[PDB]
Enzyme design. Structure first.
Site, PDB file in Angstrom:
ATOM      1  N   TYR A  26       0.730  -1.267   0.000  1.00 54.40           N
ATOM      2  CA  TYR A  26       0.000   0.000   0.000  1.00 54.40           C
ATOM      3  C   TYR A  26       0.761   1.322   0.000  1.00 54.40           C
ATOM      4  O   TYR A  26       0.143   2.370  -0.148  1.00 54.40           O
ATOM      5  CB  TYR A  26      -1.012   0.014   1.152  1.00 54.40           C
ATOM      6  CG  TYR A  26      -2.160  -0.946   0.937  1.00 54.40           C
ATOM      7  CD1 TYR A  26      -2.046  -2.295   1.279  1.00 54.40           C
ATOM      8  CD2 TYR A  26      -3.334  -0.520   0.320  1.00 54.40           C
ATOM      9  CE1 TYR A  26      -3.072  -3.199   1.009  1.00 54.40           C
ATOM     10  CE2 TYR A  26      -4.369  -1.414   0.043  1.00 54.40           C
ATOM     11  CZ  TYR A  26      -4.230  -2.753   0.386  1.00 54.40           C
ATOM     12  OH  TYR A  26      -5.243  -3.641   0.077  1.00 54.40           O
ATOM     13  N   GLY A  28       2.764   4.149  -1.634  1.00 55.62           N
ATOM     14  CA  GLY A  28       2.885   4.557  -3.020  1.00 55.62           C
ATOM     15  C   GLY A  28       1.464   4.542  -3.545  1.00 55.62           C
ATOM     16  O   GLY A  28       0.534   4.321  -2.769  1.00 55.62           O
ATOM     17  N   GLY A  30      -2.209   3.691  -4.993  1.00 60.13           N
ATOM     18  CA  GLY A  30      -3.139   2.609  -4.716  1.00 60.13           C
ATOM     19  C   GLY A  30      -2.619   1.358  -4.041  1.00 60.13           C
ATOM     20  O   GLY A  30      -1.829   1.428  -3.108  1.00 60.13           O
ATOM     21  N   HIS A  46      -3.560   5.661   5.600  1.00 58.71           N
ATOM     22  CA  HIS A  46      -3.406   6.957   4.953  1.00 58.71           C
ATOM     23  C   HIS A  46      -4.174   7.004   3.624  1.00 58.71           C
ATOM     24  O   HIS A  46      -4.810   8.009   3.291  1.00 58.71           O
ATOM     25  CB  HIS A  46      -1.922   7.268   4.733  1.00 58.71           C
ATOM     26  CG  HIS A  46      -1.696   8.677   4.213  1.00 58.71           C
ATOM     27  ND1 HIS A  46      -1.420   8.927   2.877  1.00 58.71           N
ATOM     28  CD2 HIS A  46      -1.709   9.877   4.840  1.00 58.71           C
ATOM     29  CE1 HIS A  46      -1.280  10.230   2.729  1.00 58.71           C
ATOM     30  NE2 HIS A  46      -1.451  10.813   3.891  1.00 58.71           N
ATOM     31  N   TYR A  50      -7.202   9.702   2.733  1.00 53.70           N
ATOM     32  CA  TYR A  50      -7.254  10.575   1.571  1.00 53.70           C
ATOM     33  C   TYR A  50      -8.555  10.377   0.803  1.00 53.70           C
ATOM     34  O   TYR A  50      -9.126  11.334   0.288  1.00 53.70           O
ATOM     35  CB  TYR A  50      -6.041  10.318   0.670  1.00 53.70           C
ATOM     36  CG  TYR A  50      -4.868  11.232   0.957  1.00 53.70           C
ATOM     37  CD1 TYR A  50      -4.721  11.853   2.205  1.00 53.70           C
ATOM     38  CD2 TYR A  50      -3.911  11.489  -0.025  1.00 53.70           C
ATOM     39  CE1 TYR A  50      -3.659  12.710   2.460  1.00 53.70           C
ATOM     40  CE2 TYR A  50      -2.840  12.342   0.219  1.00 53.70           C
ATOM     41  CZ  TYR A  50      -2.720  12.952   1.460  1.00 53.70           C
ATOM     42  OH  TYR A  50      -1.667  13.809   1.686  1.00 53.70           O
ATOM     43  N   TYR A  66      -2.679  23.177   3.864  1.00 50.37           N
ATOM     44  CA  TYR A  66      -3.112  23.390   5.240  1.00 50.37           C
ATOM     45  C   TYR A  66      -2.031  24.109   6.042  1.00 50.37           C
ATOM     46  O   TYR A  66      -0.963  24.435   5.515  1.00 50.37           O
ATOM     47  CB  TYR A  66      -3.471  22.058   5.913  1.00 50.37           C
ATOM     48  CG  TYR A  66      -2.460  20.949   5.720  1.00 50.37           C
ATOM     49  CD1 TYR A  66      -2.756  19.845   4.920  1.00 50.37           C
ATOM     50  CD2 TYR A  66      -1.212  20.994   6.347  1.00 50.37           C
ATOM     51  CE1 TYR A  66      -1.835  18.808   4.750  1.00 50.37           C
ATOM     52  CE2 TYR A  66      -0.287  19.967   6.180  1.00 50.37           C
ATOM     53  CZ  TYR A  66      -0.605  18.879   5.378  1.00 50.37           C
ATOM     54  OH  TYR A  66       0.322  17.874   5.185  1.00 50.37           O
ATOM     55  N   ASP A  92      -2.111  13.212   7.139  1.00 43.10           N
ATOM     56  CA  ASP A  92      -0.670  13.244   6.927  1.00 43.10           C
ATOM     57  C   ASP A  92       0.156  13.136   8.210  1.00 43.10           C
ATOM     58  O   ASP A  92       1.137  12.396   8.250  1.00 43.10           O
ATOM     59  CB  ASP A  92      -0.278  14.516   6.169  1.00 43.10           C
ATOM     60  CG  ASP A  92      -0.837  14.555   4.753  1.00 43.10           C
ATOM     61  OD1 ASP A  92      -1.284  13.496   4.245  1.00 43.10           O
ATOM     62  OD2 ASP A  92      -0.817  15.649   4.143  1.00 43.10           O
TER      63      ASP A  92
END
Ligand SMILES: [Cl-]
Ligand SMILES: [Cl-]
Lengths: 118, 118
Positions: A26, A28, A30, A46, A50, A66, A92
């Site tokens: 996982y 990188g 997709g 993560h 997203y 942000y 993040d």
């Protein structure tokens, strides 16, 4: 945004974003299968974070800028009002800290095409 | 890689990649729900293509550089031997051409948080 995530990664940890570019099933772009380890598990979460960010109005995980500060190795998300901003910064920050605390198994670099990610 | 995909996008079409940063339920990062239209379906397919690219050894969709040529508006993928390169160039070429031929419904920009994408 993504450039902020990259800097958060080196803020919280010793390894930079490039060492995760091709890790497990996982890290990188997709991915599929079962996350092979803790780190991979970090990337798995993560990715989903997203995905959920998109469920927020005017929220794009890769370009959304942000507010955050880095007091190496500490990351602080400053947004409260801007929900999209606060949400992505959390995604993040969580990943950045997760990456830092998880062991890096060189054995799991380049396995996305192996039985492991089926 | 991603930079090559961007150029393919304006090679084959009128609109550039920024035009597809926040469109429908699947253009841009990840996505969920039912692709709202032809264009969104283009993005839906591309996303799946990229995530299938991982099931190829030493193949990362975002950084793998392939061989292609642009004779505006024609895109040609040159790779034959390098399977990863060939597969990914195809993903990108297919998307680029799909974007060009599909209508751009401005009404479908910014809907990922609406009932449309669930
Ligand atoms: Cl605030
Ligand atoms: Cl060749």
């Amino acid at each position: 945004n993504l450039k902020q995530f990259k800097n958060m990664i080196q803020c919280a940890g010793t390894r930079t974003w490039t060492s995760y570019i091709g890790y497990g099933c996982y890290c990188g772009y997709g991915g599929s299968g079962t996350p092979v380890d803790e780190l991979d598990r970090c990337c798995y979460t993560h990715d989903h974070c997203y995905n959920k960010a998109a469920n927020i109005p005017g929220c794009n995980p890769l370009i959304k800028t942000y507010s955050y500060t880095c007091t190496k190795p500490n990351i602080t998300c400053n947004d409260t009002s801007d929900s999209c901003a606060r949400f992505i910064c959390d995604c993040d920050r969580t990943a950045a800290i997760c990456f830092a605390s998880a062991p890096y198994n060189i054995n799991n670099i380049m396995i996305s095409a192996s039985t492991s990610c089926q």
